[model samples]
Target: STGSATTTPIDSLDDAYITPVQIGTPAQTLNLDFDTGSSDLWVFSSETTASEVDGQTIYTPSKSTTAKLLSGATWSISYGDGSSSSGDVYTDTVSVGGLTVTGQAVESAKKVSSSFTEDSTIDGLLGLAFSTLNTVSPTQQKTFFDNAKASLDSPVFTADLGYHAPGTYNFGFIDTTAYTGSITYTAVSTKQGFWEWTSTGYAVGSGTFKSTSIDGIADTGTTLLYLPATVVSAYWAQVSGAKSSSSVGGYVFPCSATLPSFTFGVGSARIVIPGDYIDFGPISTGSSSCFGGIQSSAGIGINIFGDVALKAAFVVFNGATTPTLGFASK
Candidate 1:
């Protein structure tokens, strides 16, 4: 069966977007961040300390008759940005939109880092990355997408993210009418458990499209687009009053600067990201100072096309015979 769900952007903070998902028999609904960067479906739960869980809603598996414990199995994960969660495991019927996966592995967080603990609005994360990346110990788990793929009309999903607006995630079918123009397809390398691929080239504002490919993952969990330090510096050099500020971190430019539109190549087609997206949101409240969403990937080995870039296009995460990424405009 196919599925469709609405994904709402969290804030002008532009941090992350979340979708509703139900787990267990009675169906405990949780607003989950659909993260393609990592694997494992985890939820804030009774397992977490009351003090640590804060205002976040917990998934009570005992409340659902369909919930079953995996018995002694555990899961844990730490993101590159330092956010982390670790917990025990349970098996339950997990459903999203109208699609259901029987006996889905649902990790219940027993501990969370301060980064996640402080955010009460988010109930948990639904990882859409490759099942091979699942963090469960003893036996790895499959992602909701992978588990449901075989039941789908076609193993495919599409994301239509918007800036400060509502978007949709469609599973098992590609609605050609949701996007405009022709879709450009590209081959993806999943060796790293991510939708990793290379853009044939990229161009600065009104500059020649150099054919130097940039390899990166299409990560929905991350807020900003991360590129090499040198590449980040060059892009900012064109913006007036831009500086690599340790004070605010990353590069910052005046909010009023005439930011140029940047474009990246994908299988002979170019996807253009408007300047406003690159500016991100203001650095601080009541100020014209803004931190660019495109940051330097200093420690991380790979660049990331995060929300800033993804929101600019309609993306197809095709899980057919070979994984591929298709881009179109709306």
Candidate 2:
């Protein structure tokens, strides 16, 4: 058996790519955001007050015979953008691709912020981070991947992302067919509940490559590349008309500017992200103004190698004793 799960992206908003996950007996399928930044699987539920609920698809545990309540337990999580969710807990059968895990903890949301309320299509979040990061009351819960990892042929998964194009998340197996060239791997530091790694150096455009160590995480939940203020500013300084806009948010520039490419080091291998990918589309419709996808990670204390960086390269989130990240061109 291939022992893999195929995840397709939802191209509507391009905010976050979601996958269809089947939960409980009889298999009720729901579109979920597989977030590596978080470690809780939460869904909109029937217990959510009508005022708190919007157009989201709600899961009712009573409908599934295998569903069990983890009595008196509660969960809550908040994100960098101020989005938040809180709920009670439920134990049910959760399956992704073709693999299934029994008695998996699925947080049932009783409350959600405006960010989630507006997104009617996203049923919940399937957290891919370590179980140590799971936010639950009384007891920490294990993620579906953690529960099912031993049965998989390899303790690995890969994320293939695109711009308005359908991408995939392959679990338990690395699809070598998705990438080009050889994979360049680096040691990952996971002491803080993330796939954290360090880039030994970098270059902007055709300029002199410089040496600087940058600590960041390969996060699928985030939308753009977040680097240190100096790095972000230096990159934008190369663009003639680029300006940091508080009103516009981040750095904005002319859409027609001749942008420079960005390069990052992974051990001995250097991977380059194209200039076109660095320009994050348009700021608004019918305008020549564009926003740079790379932003400043000011207060976070670490960079975020989000979708913009991730989509430019094929990524491997795996383990062979030490956590390792393999990157290659797509």
How many backbone collisions does model 1 have?
0
Q: Candidate 1, 229: how far from true, in Å?
A: 2.4
Evaluate residue 309 in candidate 1 and report its C-alpha lDDT on the 0 to 100 scale: 84
CA displacement after TM-score superposition, residue 87 of candidate 1 (Å): 0.3
Model 2 misplacement above 4 A:
1-13
Question: Any idea what lDDT model 2 has?
Answer: 0.84
What is the per-residue lDDT of model 1 for residues 1-330, given as tens digits with 9 covering 90 to 100?
A: 899999998776668898999998799998899998998999998788777887888899889899999998999999979889999999999988898999999999999999888887789999988988999999999999999999999899888898888899999999888989999999999999999989887777898887878899999999888987877777888899999889887888898898887788887888888888787757888779888878898888899999888988999999887999999877
Q: Indicate the worst ten consecutive residues by lDDT in candidate 1.
A: 277-286
Report clashes for each candidate as comma-separated counts.
Answer: 0, 0
Would you list the clashing residue pairs of candidate 1? none
The residue pairs found clashing in candidate 2 are none
What TM-score against the true fold does each predicted structure earn? 0.97, 0.94
